[PDB]
Amino acid sequence: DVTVILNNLLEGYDNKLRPDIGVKPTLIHTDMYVNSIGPVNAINMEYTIDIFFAQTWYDRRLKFNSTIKVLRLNSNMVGKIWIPDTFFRNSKKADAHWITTPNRMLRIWNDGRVLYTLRLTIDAECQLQLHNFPMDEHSCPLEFSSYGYPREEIVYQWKRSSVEVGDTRSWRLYQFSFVGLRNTTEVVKTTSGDYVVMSVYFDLSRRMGYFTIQTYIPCTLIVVLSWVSFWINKDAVPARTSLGITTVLTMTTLSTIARKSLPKVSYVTAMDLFVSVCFIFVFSALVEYGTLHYFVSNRRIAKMDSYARIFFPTAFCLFNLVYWVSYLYL
Amino acid sequence: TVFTRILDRLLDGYDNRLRPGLGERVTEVKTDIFVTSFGPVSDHDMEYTIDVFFRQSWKDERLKFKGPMTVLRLNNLMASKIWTPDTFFHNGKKSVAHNMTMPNKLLRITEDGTLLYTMRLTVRAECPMHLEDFPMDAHACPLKFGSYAYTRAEVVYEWTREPARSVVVAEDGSRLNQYDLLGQTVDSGIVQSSTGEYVVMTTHFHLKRKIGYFVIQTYLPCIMTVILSQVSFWLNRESVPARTVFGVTTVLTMTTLSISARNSLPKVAYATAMDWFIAVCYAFVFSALIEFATVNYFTKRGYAWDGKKTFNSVSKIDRLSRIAFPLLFGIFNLVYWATYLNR
Amino acid sequence: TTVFTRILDRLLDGYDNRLRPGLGERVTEVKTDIFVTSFGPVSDHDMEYTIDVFFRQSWKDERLKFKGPMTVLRLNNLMASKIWTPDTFFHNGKKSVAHNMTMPNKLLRITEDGTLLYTMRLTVRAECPMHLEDFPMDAHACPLKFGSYAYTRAEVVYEWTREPARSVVVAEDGSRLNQYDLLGQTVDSGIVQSSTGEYVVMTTHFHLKRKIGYFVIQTYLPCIMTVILSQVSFWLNRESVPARTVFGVTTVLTMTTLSISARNSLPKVAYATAMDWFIAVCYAFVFSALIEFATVNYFTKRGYAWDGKSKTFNSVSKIDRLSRIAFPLLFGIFNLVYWATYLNR
Amino acid sequence: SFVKETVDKLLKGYDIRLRPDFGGPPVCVGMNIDIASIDMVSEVNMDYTLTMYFQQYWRDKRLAYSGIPLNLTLDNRVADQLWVPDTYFLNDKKSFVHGVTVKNRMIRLHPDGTVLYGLRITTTAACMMDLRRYPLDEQNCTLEIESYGYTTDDIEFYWRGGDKAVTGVERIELPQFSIVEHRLVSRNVVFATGAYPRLSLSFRLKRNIGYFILQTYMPSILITILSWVSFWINYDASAARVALGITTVLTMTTINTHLRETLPKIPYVKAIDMYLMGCFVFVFLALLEYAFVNYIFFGRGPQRTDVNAIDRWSRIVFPFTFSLFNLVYWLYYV
Amino acid sequence: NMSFVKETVDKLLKGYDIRLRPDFGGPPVCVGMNIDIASIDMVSEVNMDYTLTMYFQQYWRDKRLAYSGIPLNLTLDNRVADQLWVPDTYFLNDKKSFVHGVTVKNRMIRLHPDGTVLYGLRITTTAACMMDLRRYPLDEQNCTLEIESYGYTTDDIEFYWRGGDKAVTGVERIELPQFSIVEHRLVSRNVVFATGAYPRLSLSFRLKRNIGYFILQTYMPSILITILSWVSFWINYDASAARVALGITTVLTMTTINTHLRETLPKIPYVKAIDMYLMGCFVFVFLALLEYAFVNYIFFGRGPQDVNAIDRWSRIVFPFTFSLFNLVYWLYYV
């Protein structure tokens, strides 16, 4: 009884023709369930995402009159009926799933409504404004639309529950915390025509736990250690010189991780500004002793250590006051 | 001859778009897993590899046959023309259905219309890791699977035997470098989605991270560097170059060790247990150099005591530091290893 | 038009694509020509290289002779798969790509006399085994072999279209090499005995010579200057015990840093190369310089050094004076022997 | 309904084996490109990856329909039943058509027979790079479009909207480069075998210098200045000057080793290599300077010109020569 | 003389059933196998797998494919393999594999007049072998390749190495960057289960890691740093700056050696032989520096209330104990 219904629906059917091709635009209602948001790759400016993509539209050619209300079908009928050519506009690489069978579902109601769902894994490009790193926040988008059908042919619209997520604790976000998400609608003009574009924006804020312990605190300690020489006597040339140049070597070693997981962007991130200023302070402390040693011994001038005992901590605390307020509250 | 004839008639009037017993009963699938090799686990990707012989059994009443034989083996061309469950792994990322040298699949039909469906797969599933306890972390990596298109009212999954006896892991195949497979927990359930309710089968593999490598590579070198910094408390206060070089080079050594240890861990942005231990070790080595700067501030005469005038007494800061620093560091180790190893 | 479409619709009447031309009568001779669009990067880590070529094969099939106004056809890729073609494969190829963007980058032309010209565009990744003992002063001959997979020399043979030297042509800008210099190629043909029979193999060896200037600036010169710096301490007065001690150890630490840095550039092999021997000898020279001062320090007596305004003072160590000559001379001799063992080849 | 019958009639008798105007003038194919993104500019592999919207325009009278005022956009699978140009990319290493949720391909018929064939393609395109001026280098990477089997007597290539056929270049943001300009070139390659059409799209990529100033050039300059501090230190402070001299050499070694691991592996001498070696030499001579200072005093002082003279002469020459080295280096590369 | 072949080849396939094995109701079909290893590459300790490329031949006699009248062995187009029965041979420890497909699929079918079928395949297989790297780098690995039928049991299909122990060639030509193939072995056993025995063929290799790199890069510099730490014992007890700098820099150098080796070497996160040696040398340099602290305190802390004895005993115990540690180390692992 169901075999006859399926056979009759495809009799005299052309999957190459849009439903109501010369009547009105085909309205497609889209629903998305985000299984997981994969790691953000700042080097490649992209993120991974696994979703359940559901599209709903009406196809008058698939109306069937019977006691059955809906035909719950597997993926073998996807290639027999017309399917929207929905593609993700910022997907660098995306793929469906085929284990153990194609991860696709097709349900057809008696009034011609079709529900088409498939599981997708998408690597979507995301342009990261890496200023203020590692105190940076991003809204990585996910845009999809039809490929060949303009706004006069295919129109997309979100459902009452557009995007659903899971528990957010099974996700693979290493560097970021998921803040929130938003969905928008827009029409984009191209040479082929005007297209309806659906967009989802995932707002991500970078977690700062690693950078404080690994980078900020050690760099602060090295700068404080370089201030020790201001209390060592000026006659202890081997002690102050070795302390000054070894903190420079330590600061150079620490400076090698300021730009490690991020691309070779040529603007100064917040992490690089802090490391560079720390390198200047330890550089200036060693130069401070060199100036003091030359003028005192090798011919106010002789009170440089007393001035540097207060000026260096004051200027470093003043720099930290400006630095942390600007990137956290400004 | 008879074997050929039954195969020709086996799919006459057969619609593979309809699940068996549609409109009469829910399709019952008895699953069965044989883990050949619980493959490598990637901390940097939060995913694990597993090699299994995934089995599924159900009844297709339309495929009953009469003949001298009792079991029919179907080739891959005919197996693709027969309805099979649309089983998928919920947490799988990119699995492989092996095709060498032929499709590693086998469909067998019993006389009463019972189908046994076996396939060899390399499932690359996901495992959500919370590495706050790293390297003393334990994880329960799941393997959830079920039907994609059929809700619980159409296709139902169950384990063929008792759930603990349905996932059989190979004794030889463990393939874990930094984990120990304590055991697996097997259970089923129902999940809720916008498209209905689905039967889900879960299998959790419990992994305990091995710590011996991290003790010798990170913890022991960091502990000994903290000891060397406190060794400076016994050097005489008049050896300013020696005590200065001792302090800064230990800080440089700690910095060298801190970077190396962090480079081994996956790039998470939250502080782990190893991060706190190194941070505290960084504080002790920092404080030892600060301690000498205070001792040197109250040193009066440059010369030290000779073999046989006034001479500097032993610093009270030095004498108390010889006790406070080792005792505080020993206290910190007692709290640290009790908090993370007793969980 | 109708004449042209009638020829295509009747060429394959009674054509058996399972049988090679002249099966049981003669030997199928295939003329082969390679144009190398680019010689891609060479991966010393994977011991492999990529090569973008236009692969041309010309043979004859008397079952495909046609009569009409034109003297050459042009088959679409659907009909190109209905006609027997040589099963040419690359013996050392690892993962080759047949481009089909935006359409299959193939072309099958049939001439009136039944001569087929088959051209395809391929990106072949072939394995190039290397002996990195003389690294970074090593030269290699990366091969590119191909032949019939299933047909022995009694059924299918391969010959170059023209003289072998002029059958493999490299474009003027086909050298996409950062680390090597392509010195040219040698083209040859031969026979291999297998477990399944004797097969014709067409061979092309690309001769590559590694560039040396990068390793001189990055590895050899810093190592030579580090060893020179270690021997500079011999000219410091023996009373500068802390100075000559930090001079020794920091030079050792510097040599440790350079040794690891230079080893990163070379792919991870578990045998010693010419760069390892140079660094190890440089390691020993820096190690021995600190041992030299340890002996000198053992025989120093007075803790004070010579004063400009001049008591009894230490003499210049005979070990120091002899090491001021022996160490620079021994390293010079080593450099003379090292740079003549590998460069002269 | 009426649209259904017209398409069935158009595709009935259509021979994919024959080009439009098969026996007559060459079919004139017009090409537009909308570049979605450029990424993975590789110096080691000498290639770059771009994603683009590739549109081909040509007229086939066999696909003309009347009585329908609409531009018939069809399912992508109809493209396999129609003749399309055999367009390929010459310098393409590896490319694919995106296929999620379906193959990213469009066919749009027009009443006059015009066919619009669109493709979303990600292509890794080879381009030889001259990196002897790295990081102050400028690269010109191209994309070559050709017909595999048709000569200029059967197919013609032009840029539809000549100077505006390629769009989206001005919106591309490369972390390491800036696109100075791009050019569209149309020509025929004249061979003895025949003339073949070719379309060439080329960009001029200029690497950004701000990154290397922060990571490679500024640290090296500061360490070189630090090595000059010993020239103001007293000659009798042997431990201080030796420690300062040899620690700057180790510090310079750490910088070079760090760059050799973070920068791409380009095994030949570049502009950055010339600078790092020059800085390593300057700190090398600063430590070597004190050896002369120490040996003149403690080696030839007893026998018995001025120890202070070598230091004072070094306080002027070393800063002067480093600026002289810098002045020549930057003029030669900028 | 091709018309006879064309009739014969078409006559063989007319009436052929691909779903039935040779001798469907009779004795098991014996399949002989040969392997010609083209190369082995990427023997990875981290992934615990190796990649090998081989020519995998299978031989069996099909009475239905026997022909008479042609004295030749009919080598057919490789696409005829889709029309014949072939064994369902797979590899148990295969992680991923593929048949090479340029310019065509790299497979061969060759019939013989008596009915023998030769089915060859050029396969690149990533196979998984568990590696015990506790003795690394002084470790010998044993990586195998298990070959089995997926569905048939020993009553329907039987495996054997064709020709004997020379069924696998090309092993002597295998070259690995960091291993030496000591030998290979061929095993033919039936795995007996409750359901029924299954034919299996096993090919195993013994890999021996080369030690030349580790001697000069890991062991030799570590030995030199340890010996250099003993120099302080011959320095005067009151030379605090020299002995502390020598002691603490050798500790830093050992850390630099150990941490960088951790970066370069493959990431195997459990205790290996190389870890023990580096840790042992780090204890000695720690103790040598700690020895001076005892000497310094005894002279300066307990002095006013002999430090020549501690130094002279350290000059013997440290060289002797480090010699003993190497003797114990190089005997347990070698």
Ligand SMILES: *[C@@H]1O[C@H](CO)[C@@H](O[C@@H]2O[C@H](CO)[C@@H](O[C@@H]3O[C@H](CO[C@H]4O[C@H](CO[C@H]5O[C@H](CO)[C@@H](O)[C@H](O)[C@@H]5O)[C@@H](O)[C@H](O[C@H]5O[C@H](CO)[C@@H](O)[C@H](O)[C@@H]5O)[C@@H]4O)[C@@H](O)[C@H](O[C@H]4O[C@H](CO)[C@@H](O)[C@H](O)[C@@H]4O[C@H]4O[C@H](CO)[C@@H](O)[C@H](O)[C@@H]4O[C@H]4O[C@H](CO)[C@@H](O)[C@H](O)[C@@H]4O)[C@@H]3O)[C@H](O)[C@H]2NC(C)=O)[C@H](O)[C@H]1NC(C)=O
């Ligand atoms: C340049 O050349 C390359 C190489 O040739 C081209 O790459 C090829 O591209 C084409 C077009 O996209 C592919 O064909 C379709 O593939 C899909 C997907 O399955 C394939 O791909 C999966 C994923 O591979 C990924 O990576 C590869 C690269 O490595 C990439 O190419 C690919 O796009 C993707 O990114 C594989 O996992 C999958 O293998 C799995 O499944 C196999 C069985 O399918 C199994 O044998 C394997 O072991 C493994 O488990 C497979 O390789 C196919 O779904 C699709 O087949 C459907 O559509 C065609 C359309 O003509 C139709 O003929 C088929 O019958 C089938 O449609 C039926 O099934 C549908 C799904 O159930 C259903 O929806 C339909 O309604 C229909 O059902 C009807 O028939 C069935 C019986 O068939 C019946 O039961 C029903 O009742 C009903 O009547 C195509 O095969 C090639 O796979 C791909 N090849 C390669 C090597 O990459 C590239 O495109 C070229 N580029 C250019 C510019 O020309």
Ligand SMILES: *[C@@H]1O[C@H](CO)[C@@H](O[C@@H]2O[C@H](CO)[C@@H](O[C@@H]3O[C@H](CO[C@H]4O[C@H](CO)[C@@H](O)[C@H](O[C@H]5O[C@H](CO)[C@@H](O)[C@H](O)[C@@H]5O)[C@@H]4O)[C@@H](O)[C@H](O[C@H]4O[C@H](CO)[C@@H](O)[C@H](O)[C@@H]4O)[C@@H]3O)[C@H](O)[C@H]2NC(C)=O)[C@H](O)[C@H]1NC(C)=O
């Ligand atoms: C990256 O690097 C590539 C490679 O170097 C650059 O590509 C080159 O760009 C230049 C500048 O745009 C191109 O030259 C131009 O070519 C066009 C087209 O010429 C073709 O068609 C003509 C049709 O009339 C025909 O006459 C030409 O034949 C002549 O020239 C060829 C050589 O190109 C020669 O072999 C023949 O014998 C003829 O002499 C050819 O078929 C041309 O129209 C341009 O002319 C301009 O300049 C002339 C100067 O006298 C002027 O008279 C014209 O009015 C016009 O202003 C010009 O010659 C070159 O062809 C490109 N080469 C390739 C391989 O693509 C690319 O520009 C670089 N990118 C960047 C961003 O810099």
Ligand SMILES: *[C@@H]1O[C@H](CO)[C@@H](O[C@@H]2O[C@H](CO)[C@@H](O[C@@H]3O[C@H](CO[C@H]4O[C@H](CO)[C@@H](O)[C@H](O[C@H]5O[C@H](CO)[C@@H](O)[C@H](O)[C@@H]5O)[C@@H]4O)[C@@H](O)[C@H](O[C@H]4O[C@H](CO)[C@@H](O)[C@H](O)[C@@H]4O)[C@@H]3O)[C@H](O)[C@H]2NC(C)=O)[C@H](O)[C@H]1NC(C)=O
């Ligand atoms: C890497 O590591 C693997 C695993 O250890 C090595 O593989 C092993 O190699 C050895 C050889 O070095 C193999 O031993 C030989 O095995 C054959 C085959 O045995 C099978 O068939 C026999 C009948 O032909 C049968 O008797 C065997 O049954 C035995 O094992 C079962 C196990 O359940 C047991 O129940 C039985 O009681 C038997 O003990 C089995 O089915 C065998 O024919 C050989 O016999 C030789 O030696 C015996 C004396 O021991 C002698 O009597 C014979 O005449 C003959 O000389 C021999 O046992 C071993 O089987 C391999 N194991 C596996 C799992 O592959 C591999 O060699 C390593 N690599 C390298 C490079 O070394």
Ligand SMILES: CCCCCCCC(=O)OC[C@H](COP(=O)(O)O[C@@H]1[C@H](O)[C@H](O)[C@@H](OP(=O)(O)O)[C@H](OP(=O)(O)O)[C@H]1O)OC(=O)CCCCCCC
């Ligand atoms: C991190 C430490 C920070 C300390 C910050 C605070 C530092 C601070 O306040 O130092 C002062 C004092 C110095 O102690 P210390 O023994 O080093 O210095 C002696 C002290 O100054 C005597 O008073 C001097 O004698 P006199 O009267 O002139 O004859 C004596 O001279 P000499 O006879 O030898 O020539 C000096 O050597 O230390 C404490 O009181 C230790 C408090 C507990 C410290 C507990 C620390 C754990």
Ligand SMILES: CCCCCCCC(=O)OC[C@H](COP(=O)(O)O[C@@H]1[C@H](O)[C@H](O)[C@@H](OP(=O)(O)O)[C@H](OP(=O)(O)O)[C@H]1O)OC(=O)CCCCCCC
């Ligand atoms: C790694 C090399 C190890 C070499 C180990 C070599 C060990 C070895 O043999 O040492 C002995 C001697 C040390 O000589 P050196 O110059 O170091 O020291 C002098 C020596 O001790 C005299 O005996 C002292 O004279 P005196 O009697 O008190 O008046 C003199 O006192 P003073 O005038 O300062 O007050 C000291 O300076 O060396 C050689 O003769 C060089 C041999 C060739 C060495 C060739 C080295 C290349």
Ligand SMILES: *[C@@H]1O[C@H](CO)[C@@H](O)[C@H](O)[C@H]1NC(C)=O
């Ligand atoms: C977003 O999703 C909600 C919920 O489905 C829907 O009501 C709304 O129309 C969508 N679009 C915008 C722009 O909010």
Ligand SMILES: [Cl-]
């Ligand atoms: Cl992330």
Ligand SMILES: [Cl-]
């Ligand atoms: Cl693991």
Ligand SMILES: [Cl-]
């Ligand atoms: Cl190269």
